[PDB]
Write a protein that binds this ligand. Structure first.
Ligand SMILES: [Mg+2]
Ligand SMILES: [Mg+2]
Lengths: 235, 233, 231, 212, 195, 240, 222, 204, 244
């Protein structure tokens, strides 16, 4: 056939470029970074009404100060999460401190290109890694299967990413509050989702310095959705 | 873990105003048997370093080959091998010190005490010690084995601290070294009369002296000594 | 065509297409400039962002107090090669109490990249590197290609539109080599060089990345408002 | 060394001395023999200081990974067994460890596990470990009741360390008190044995043999 | 640990095991249950070096429980005892052997017979009407040799067991803090809470 | 060793070996899981193309992983045994180290992890198996039902079906299963499970297997006659 | 039989002030009854405002210090030039030491610097990595001669306020850097008088927010 | 401490006219403590008989091992193993543990099914074969057995006479050994019939 | 490199089938027919040797029926050499179990073990599967008399009567027609031989073209005897049943 670690004539790794196509098919995940915190939100996208949607875990805690949202082949993310948690805890053990969000992201991204003929293929999942440390404050990173990670003020990944990113382009500014970010994620998720957005098919979360990483209750998110509807009907 | 078989005794050395002097006798002992009388224990590396080695001779010969190999390796893909990127005494020592400590950590030491004497690129005197345990230390005077007990006291009367180094000439330093070698010949049962002496000067370079002998010895007073107490005849 | 399926296959004209495709990844990468005088060596790198929300990808990596590089192409490969350089620099210091010569650092990178071109299963590195350093023989600038070819130069540029900066340095050769004991003027020449590779976009405060090493100057990277001086 | 821990109505009391010796030489009087594994779990230090510190700190890392994966507080049983299984792998290598893994969970309630470098793992209500363990046991056994108040239980642990600190040459310095509840442990201060002895002697009328 | 006794009567196996756990100078516990249920009708008591005893017992337990699930079937006491013996026989030539002696009391539901197996740390297996490990046999076997009958009831076995324990409490220097007694029969395993 | 990357991405971002493993599941006999208020029922199809079978000894479709958890499946039978074995070993390992039996979610997460591992490991193909894992957590009376598939994704279901014609029985379950009021009793849950299989099975004779799992390790497999009574009652109500 | 360990003598002393920290050590290096060097630096500036000394067997001492300095360097590479805090350095050193639990670094390690609140910090380690933040710690040959003196003169142990007669303790007033250095010098002068392995020179490294400063003092050379 | 004398016990084997006899005591002990009076030390694989003295765990282990090996032998060869062949198998198996041996004293006894020739053999713990015509002895009372056998034995004894000789050799040897006795078993082996007899002896 | 020549033996087809397993089954369909029939008082194994020669030494020959232990036997259909590799592994497993538990291995446990080995070759290793289908005839004290079959996929199932090899469709129909639950060994012997006689591709069924075996409790009292029939004994049973 052909090598797994083969370069295309354009100078790209076939398998990495193909894994990016799998991520495009994944459910939408959006992250927005502010000075009051970073918000992470996801489309759950249950394949059937009999599927208990609260068992869909696409937002995940890595440490108290670092959260993570995923999009694509979500099964692939489990070993990445496991490694991230291990890296976070191990660094705390060696250095009696929290690990920097960038350093954690870098540790996860080191796995990405460890494939060949190590694992047999790249990961088919993108991660939005959000967190806080004392040095660089609130941060949001986009970890790809290429091994590259970009820091973002706001970022959308998944099927509705380019439409959502264009929306994030206009909406994001440096003085956003946490509440404003929460509604903004919900607004853009609702825009790109096939099914109608509610507290059962969408999930919110955030990371603040004080309270750390928190996944939002369906009751809490439901209020924010109702608050969103009213403010859009307000003009 | 081994035991030393063929052994070399004291290596002595000291700093002076423009460089360093190092000396060691030409004996390879086999226990109490003075087996080999033509053993060179001062091994020059380039024109700026002399490594003096005591203890196990088979391990010395191994170390001698490592240093020879080091010079070869340094010359590979190195247009400045005989200039800016030549081997320094500090490079040679740190390498040996690494090896010595690694070998002791594997419980298979090189059974030696080593003194690396030389002059650096900037003209600074280099004199540092390393042994089978990987223990390292520097001092205006350094000596191994019996030299530590008998040579150092004499050499320290010349250079007692760092500030005495610029006041000490090569003639005074060499005189003290040569006298110390005589004292060691009087008092070390595993020493020989024949020795080698090396001077590494920042101006005149490396002067390597072979086939030196202990001379001006005092023995005449022995004729008057009779018995062990009461005996007169 | 039929001879580009893997790195172990020569073409009928004696070419290694996988290596050439890896070389192509560098051309897609953002421009970075390297230049030196007799006292200092300077890296100037145009950082690339994904979009307006994203950060600008870091281009320059420190390898030791006296050495570092700038990258163009696959950033993870640069991280692997820079990590290897860090270790080799560190091995030299720990074992030999000796700072690693920049020329020897280039020889090590060449050999590491070479093994990836002759063996089955692996792939060539998809990144080009510009290594600057100050060692016992003064200032140095190297250009690394993932084919294995490392070249010592007065100045150079790699990445997209790098030919413009490379021509400028070829003209300015006699001027910038003489900029001794003046770090700011040497950086200016580097910033003016990389400007020849720009189209549409210009050098902003979070766009520009500069690094310098010299006689009494440890390898230090300048980003953010630290490079506003040179815009 | 003297370390104790006992279960009671209000949870667990953990009490330790503070002395560290190298032969007859008193190396330190300010040693921490309670390892704060996490906000809910405590471990005591006896035998090898490094072995207890290192592995019970490592311990906190394993528990943190457990509750991240399982989204639930680790049990004291599972907690203590991670340590006992670990030291058991090292059995024969020369680890020196005598510790009480103390915790208070929903499913178990207040639980204490004595864990040993020989691989011993014992659940129990009262444990005492160290060179002064026998002295502490005496005070504990004669005064212990399940229906002790948190105030009286804290004093009993303090008084039992004092008993050992006085008689055992290799125990003393100061007493560290902890109270373990379901919502987490609560630190109850450092108490110098020198000042505590005279205070207790007067107020209690004990130690009549000693002149004060 | 110290004393573990076993007696196979007409229709059951009775295992008596000491409650004391002594670590050097102090008795740390006086209610320790030195036994593990391997399967519903198979009980194993154990005594030997600290840590090894429980580690081994639980390891065996896990393996028998695994077999029970895989096959949906309870192994005969004989089969379990052979498995245990092999593990100990494997262990004795290991880098660090399990220093554990065991008694396996089981009721064979196929044959409708109680069975007692004595296995030491070397992997020395013997099927017995009554057994012990360590010094326990030295005090008790003369009484068991005298009084034992193969047609004894469970209640008679317990009375003979009490006499054995009384002799131990009289002549042994160590205070083993009494014994926990368990009975293995056709209905399964149960503990005699008053002894 | 054999290191060949069998599971790889295609230009359209698909891993065909994982997707072809799902096609093996589609071919497998139908399996269905329905959780009531205080029970879970696992229904399984037995294709009647194979008669002269010995049903005493023939591998049953539902397997106990522990005394409190069960696993059924659709797809390659030989593959399922490897997952069942690993699950049973991990269940005992969990009891040994944590001193507590596995939760149904944990056991699911483990099996799903094994399946995932085989989708990006060299020299191996994915499992041609989807599983339904059901049971009750220790000291818990809330019913649990999970589904896994070759890719390694898993999730919780109020009711779910896998295998051939699973589209049809899922259609049935989606209109007949009410979340606000699930099958309150064992009878109602078993009945709904048998009904859902009768949409696909053919004959309600030896083609339907039913296993009822209740809290506190109370698992029992229904016999032919017991199931036949449900089949009889369902069709007699249908004649109207 | 080959003995991989040796004793190079020496004595070190770490004292934590209110907004400063000192780590002192004699410069004499010995084996048995011989002096190897009268000036062999034992306390080292390891970067990030941390000073370190690993006293005892000098080969292990040098190896540990070298590995820790290396760890500081790699901490910068891996974590965006972040400053290694003294508490983080201390935990890292525990792992370096415990890494060789079954073939230990035969040293008593002390580090000194400032904590993240700017207060003086000293950490003390045993050979296998058990460590502890302390206010006052002497290590090495004459540690038993120095610590009782420090208990008395730094912590004012057994000292009571005149007139009260044992009822009121002497209050624990904060010592200045000049006051600490006096106690360090007198500790080593006394140790030199009564311990044969102590002498030649005293090198003190003082750590403040401004950086690391060095002070050297002569000691008796007999 | 000495593994070969912890458990105690003995085996003796003798040849007669168209017959062999192998016999053993029934004791298993923990040094001074008698543990079992039913520990049989003679086993058989088809028509080949194996006695094993020494460390009891190894006695059991080797029996299980030779059952294992003779069963596979039979399946592949499609015939029962012979005494001469089995003797070589015992020797090979013991010597493969040359530097970690089973602490045993095995004794092979049987009649070759094709030639009808009586065969006996003994081994040390490490595999060295002693193929004696007259008799083989093993165990903690091997000296006593050598003394008894050397005087009592005469060649070409009839099965029922051989029984008396080997029984008296075992019994009186065991009665002079603290770690042997507690019952005894004697196998009288002919080409196509084997008789097993439990002996009555003192139980101290 | 080497990838070019890799057949990839362990992959799914687009339909979700294992190519090599399916092709191995095709191979087995050309092998001599083997039949197993389970009765209340024993099991019968009957199997057809493939187009033999008059010079073949039949009495010492064994290509179909093999003994795993005293209680369990197998009938082979496919590559004989592949079968012998597996047979020896099964014989070892039975002995390992006997050594461990001091009890004869239950039939299903042995069958599962061999079936798991076959399975492994279909999922990993990149090797071709074993081109073998077994019929396992065996007895244990739990389930009594048992018939199983395994095939290259590693899938096994239990049977009252079953065929493998050539003409299984025709053979299975004939067995399904004449088999009954209260049947006895002597009746099963007759059914097996009658089925082979009709499904055979040869002109006539003779003793030299057959291998035959029975597992009976027809052993003196509570125990089981395996009987691998000799050429003369197969000739006798052919006359008795009235086929020749
Ligand atoms: Mg002094
Ligand atoms: Mg007796």
């Amino acid at each position: 056939d052909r090598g797994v670690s083969t370069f295309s004539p354009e100078g790209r790794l076939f398998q990495v470029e193909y894994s990016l196509e799998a991520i495009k098919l994944g459910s939408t995940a959006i992250g927005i970074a502010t000075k009051e915190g970073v918000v992470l939100g996801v489309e759950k996208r249950a394949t059937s009404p009999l599927l208990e949607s609260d068992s869909i875990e696409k937002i995940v805690e890595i440490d108290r100060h670092i959260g993570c949202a995923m999009s694509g082949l979500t099964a692939d993310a489990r070993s990445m999460i496991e490694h991230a948690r291990t890296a976070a805890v191990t660094h705390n053990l060696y250095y009696d401190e929290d690990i920097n969000v960038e350093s954690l992201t870098q540790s996860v991204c080191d796995l990405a290109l460890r494939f060949g003929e190590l694992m047999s293929r790249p990961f088919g999942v993108a991660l939005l890694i959000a967190g806080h440390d004392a040095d660089d404050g609130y941060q949001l990173f986009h970890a790809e299967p290429s091994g590259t990670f970009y820091r973002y003020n706001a970022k959308a990944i998944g099927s509705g990413s380019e439409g959502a990113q264009a929306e994030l382009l206009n909406e994001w500014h440096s003085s956003l509050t946490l509440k404003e970010a929460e509604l903004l994620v919900l607004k853009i998720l609702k825009q790109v989702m096939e099914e109608k957005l509610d507290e059962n098919n969408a999930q919110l979360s955030c990371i603040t310095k004080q309270d750390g990483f928190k996944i939002y209750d369906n009751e809490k998110t439901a209020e924010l959705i109702k608050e969103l509807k009213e403010k859009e009907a307000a003009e | 873990t081994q035991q030393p078989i063929v052994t070399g005794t004291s290596v002595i050395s000291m700093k002076y105003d423009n460089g360093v002097i190092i000396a060691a006798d030409n004996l390879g002992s086999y226990g109490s048997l003075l087996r080999f009388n033509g053993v060179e224990r001062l091994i020059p590396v380039g024109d700026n370093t002399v490594v003096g080695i005591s203890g196990d001779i088979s391990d010395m010969q191994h170390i001698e080959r490592l240093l020879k190999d080091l010079v070869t390796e340094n010359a590979y893909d190195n247009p400045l091998a005989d200039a800016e990127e030549a081997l320094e005494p500090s490079y040679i020592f740190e390498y040996l010190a690494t090896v010595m400590y690694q070998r002791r950590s594997k419980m298979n030491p090189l059974w030696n005490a080593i003194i690396v004497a030389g002059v650096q690129s900037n003209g600074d005197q280099f004199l540092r010690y390393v042994n089978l345990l990987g223990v390292t230390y520097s001092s205006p005077t350094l000596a191994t084995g019996f030299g530590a007990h008998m040579a150092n006291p004499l050499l320290r009367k010349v250079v007692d601290r760092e500030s005495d180094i610029p006041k000490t000439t090569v003639q005074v330093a060499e005189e003290a070294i040569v006298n110390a070698m005589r004292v060691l010949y009087y008092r070390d049962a595993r020493s020989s009369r024949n020795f080698s002496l090396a001077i590494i000067d920042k101006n005149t370079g490396l002067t390597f002296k072979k086939n030196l002998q202990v001379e001006n010895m005092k023995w005449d007073f022995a004729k008057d000594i009779k018995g062990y107490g009461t005996q007169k005849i | 065509n039929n001879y580009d399926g893997d790195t172990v296959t020569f073409s009928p004209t004696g070419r290694l297409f996988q290596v050439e495709y890896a070389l192509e990844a560098i051309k897609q990468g953002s421009v970075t400039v390297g230049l030196r005088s007799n006292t200092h060596a300077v890296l100037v790198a145009l950082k690339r962002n994904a979009d307006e929300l994203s950060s600008y990808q870091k281009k320059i990596i420190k390898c030791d107090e006296h050495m570092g590089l700038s990258l163009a192409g696959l950033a993870p490969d640069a991280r692997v090669l820079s990590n290897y350089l860090r270790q080799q620099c560190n091995y030299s210091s720990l074992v030999f109490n000796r700072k690693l010569a920049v020329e020897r650092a280039g020889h090590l990178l060449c050999d590491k990249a070479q093994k990836n071109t002759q063996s089955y299963g692996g792939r060539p590195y998809g990144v080009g590197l510009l290594i600057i350093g100050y060692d016992k023989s003064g200032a140095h600038l190297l250009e690394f290609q993932p084919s294995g070819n490392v070249t010592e130069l007065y100045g150079t540029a790699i990445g997209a539109r790098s030919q413009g900066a490379k021509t400028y340095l070829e003209r300015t050769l006699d001027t910038f080599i003489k900029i001794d004991g003046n770090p700011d003027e040497l950086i200016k020449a580097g910033v003016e060089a990389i400007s020849q590779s720009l189209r549409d976009e210009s050098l902003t405060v979070d766009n520009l990345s500069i690094a310098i090493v010299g006689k009494d100057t440890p390898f230090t990277i300048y980003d953010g408002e630290a490079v506003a001086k040179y815009i | 060394t003297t370390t104790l821990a006992f279960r009671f109505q209000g949870g667990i009391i953990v009490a330790v001395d503070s002395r560290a010796t190298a032969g007859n030489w008193v190396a330190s009087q300010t040693v921490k023999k309670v390892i704060e594994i996490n906000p809910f779990l405590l471990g005591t230090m006896a035998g090898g200081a490094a072995d207890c510190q290192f592995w019970e700190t490592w311990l906190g890392s394993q528990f943190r990974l457990h509750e991240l994966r399982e989204k639930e507080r680790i049990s004291v049983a599972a907690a203590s067994k991670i340590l006992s299984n670990l030291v058991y792998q090292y059995k024969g290598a020369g680890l020196s460890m005598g510790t009480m893994i103390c915790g208070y969970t929903r499913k178990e309630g207040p639980t204490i596990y004595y864990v040993d470098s020989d691989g011993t793992r014992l659940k129990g209500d009262i444990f005492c470990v160290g060179s002064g363990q026998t002295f502490a046991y005496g005070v504990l056994d004669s005064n212990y009741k399940w229906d002790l108040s948190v105030e009286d239980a804290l004093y009993l642990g303090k008084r039992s360390i004092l008993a050992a600190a006085h008689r055992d040459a290799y125990s003393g310095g100061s007493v560290n008190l902890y109270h373990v509840t379901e919502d987490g442990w609560i630190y109850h201060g450092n108490h110098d044995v020198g000042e505590l002895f005279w205070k207790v002697k007067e107020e209690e009328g004990s130690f009549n043999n000693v002149i004060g | 640990m110290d004393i573990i006794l076993g007696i196979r009567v007409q229709d059951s196996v009775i295992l008596a095991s000491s409650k004391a756990v002594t670590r050097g100078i102090s008795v740390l516990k006086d209610s320790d249950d030195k036994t593990r249920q391997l399967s519903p009708h198979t009980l194993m008591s154990f005594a030997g070096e600290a840590g090894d005893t429980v580690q081994f017992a639980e390891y065996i337990q896990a393996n028998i429980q695994l077999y029970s699930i895989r096959e949906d079937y309870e192994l005969s006491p004989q089969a379990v005892s052979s498995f245990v013996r092999q593990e100990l026989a494997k262990s004795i030539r290991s880098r660090r052997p399990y220093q554990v002696n065991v008694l396996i009391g089981g009721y064979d539901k196929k044959k409708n017979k109680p069975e007692l197996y004595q296995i030491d740390y070397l992997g020395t297996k013997v099927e017995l009407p009554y057994g012990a490990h360590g010094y326990s046999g030295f005090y008790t076997f003369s009484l068991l040799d005298h009084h034992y009958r193969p047609d004894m009831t469970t209640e008679e076995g317990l009375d003979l067991l009490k006499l054995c324990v009384q002799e131990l409490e009289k002549r042994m220097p160590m205070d083993f803090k009494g014994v926990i007694v368990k009975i293995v029969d056709k209905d399964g395993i149960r503990q005699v809470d008053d002894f | 060793g054999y290191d060949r990357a069998l599971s790889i991405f295609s230009p359209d971002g698909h891993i065909f070996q994982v997707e072809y493993a799902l096609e093996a599941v589609k071919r497998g006999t139908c399996a269905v899981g329905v959780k009531g208020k205080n029970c879970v029922v696992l229904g399984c199809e037995r294709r009647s193309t194979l008669k002269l079978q010995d049903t005493r000894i023939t591998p049953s479709k539902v397997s106990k992983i522990d005394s409190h958890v069960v696993l059924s499946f659709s797809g390659l039978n030989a593959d399922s045994r490897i997952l069942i074995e690993k699950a049973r070993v991990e269940a005992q390992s969990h009891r040994l180290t944590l001193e507590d039996p596995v939760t149904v979610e944990y056991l699911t997460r483990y099996v799903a992890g094994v399946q995932q591992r085989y989708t990006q490991s060299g020299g191996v193909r994915p499992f041609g198996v989807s599983t339904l894992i059901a049971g009750f957590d220790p000291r818990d009376d809330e019913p649990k039902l999970y589904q896994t598939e070759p890719s390694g994704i898993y999730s919780s279901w109020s009711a779910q079906t896998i295998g051939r014609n699973s589209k049809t029985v899922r259609e049935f379950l989606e209109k007949n299963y009410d979340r606000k009021e699930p099958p309150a009793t064992v009878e109602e849950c078993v009945k709904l499970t048998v009904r859902s299989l009768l949409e696909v099975v053919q004959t309600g004779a030896k083609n339907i297997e039913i296993t009822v799992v209740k809290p506190d390790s109370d698992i029992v497999a229904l016999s032919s006659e017991e199931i036949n009574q449900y089949v009889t009652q369902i069709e007699q109500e249908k004649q109207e | 039989q080959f003995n991989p360990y040796g004793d190079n003598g020496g004595t070190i002393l770490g004292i934590a002030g209110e907004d400063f920290a000192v780590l002192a050590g004699d410069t004499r290096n010995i084996t048995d009854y011989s002096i190897n060097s009268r000036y062999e630096p034992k306390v080292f500036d390891c970067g990030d405002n941390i000073v370190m000394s690993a006293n005892g067997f000098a080969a292990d001492g040098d190896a540990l210090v070298k590995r820790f300095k290396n760890s500081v360097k790699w901490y910068h590479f891996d974590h965006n030039d972040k400053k290694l805090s003294i508490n983080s350095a201390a935990r890292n050193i525990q792992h370096l030491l415990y890494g060789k639990r079954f073939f230990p670094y035969y040293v008593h390690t002390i580090i000194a610097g400032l904590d993240e609140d700017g207060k003086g910090a000293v950490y003390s380690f045993d050979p296998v990595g058990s460590y502890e933040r302390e206010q006052c710690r002497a290590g090495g040959a004459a540690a038993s001669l120095i610590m009782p003196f420090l208990d008395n003169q730094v912590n004012f142990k057994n000292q009571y306020e005149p007139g009260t007669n044992g009822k009121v303790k002497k209050p624990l007033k904060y010592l200045s850097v000049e006051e600490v250095i006096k106690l360090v010098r007198d500790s080593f002068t006394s140790a030199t008088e009564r311990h044969i392995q102590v002498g030649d020179g005293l090198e003190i490294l003082i750590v403040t927010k401004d950086g690391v400063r060095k002070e050297f003092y002569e000691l008796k050379r007999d | 401490s000495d593994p070969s004398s912890i458990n105690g016990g003995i085996v003796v084997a003798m040849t007669g006219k168209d017959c062999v006899a192998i016999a053993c005591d029934l004791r298993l002990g923990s040094q001074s403590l008698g543990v079992s009076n039913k520990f049989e030390k003679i086993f058989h694989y088809g028509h080949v008989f194996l006695g094993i003295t020494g460390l009891a765990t190894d006695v059991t282990t080797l029996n299980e091992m030779f059952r294992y090996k003779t069963n596979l032998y039979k399946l592949k060869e499609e015939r029962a193993i012979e005494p001469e062949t089995f003797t070589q198998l015992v020797s090979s198996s013991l010597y493969e543990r040359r530097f970690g041996p089973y602490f045993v004293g095995p004794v092979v006894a049987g009649i070759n099914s094709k030639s009808g020739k009586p065969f006996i053999a003994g081994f040390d713990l490490i595999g060295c074969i002693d193929e004696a015509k007259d008799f083989i002895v093993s165990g903690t009372a091997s000296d006593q057995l050598f003394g008894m056998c050397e005087s009592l034995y005469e060649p070409n004894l009839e099965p029922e006479d051989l029984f008396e000789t080997i029984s008296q050799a075992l019994l009186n040897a065991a009665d002079r050994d603290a770690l042997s006795g507690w019952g005894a078993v004697v196998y009288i082996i002919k080409k196509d019939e084997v008789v097993k007899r439990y002996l009555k002896m003192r139980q101290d | 490199g080497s990838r070019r020549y890799d057949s990839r033996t362990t992959i799914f087809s687009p339909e979700g089938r294992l190519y090599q397993v399916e092709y191995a089954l095709e191979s087995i369909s050309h092998a001599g027919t083997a039949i197993g029939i389970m009765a209340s008082d024993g099991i019968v194994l009957a199997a057809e040797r493939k187009v033999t020669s008059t010079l073949l030494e039949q009495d010492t020959s064994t290509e179909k029926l093999y003994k795993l232990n005293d209680k369990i036997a197998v009938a082979v259909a496919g590559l004989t050499a592949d079968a012998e590799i597996l047979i020896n592994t099964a014989r070892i497993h039975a002995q390992n179990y006997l050594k461990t538990y001091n009890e004869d291995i239950p039939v299903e446990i042995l069958v599962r073990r061999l079936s798991d080995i076959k399975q492994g070759y279909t999922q990993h290793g990149g090797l071709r599967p074993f081109g073998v289908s077994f019929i396992y005839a065996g007895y244990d004290d739990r389930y009594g008399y048992q018939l199983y079959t395994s095939n290259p996929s590693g899938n096994y199932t239990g049977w009252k009567a079953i065929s493998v090899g050539a003409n299984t469709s025709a053979a299975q129909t004939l067995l399904q027609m004449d088999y009954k639950d209260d049947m006895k060994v002597d009746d099963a012997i007759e059914l097996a031989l009658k089925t082979l006689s009709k499904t055979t591709d040869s002109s006539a069924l003779t003793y030299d073209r057959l291998e035959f075996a029975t597992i009976r409790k027809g052993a003196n009292d509570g125990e089981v005897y395996q009987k691998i029939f000799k050429p003369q004994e197969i000739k006798d049973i052919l006359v008795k049943t009235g086929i020749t």
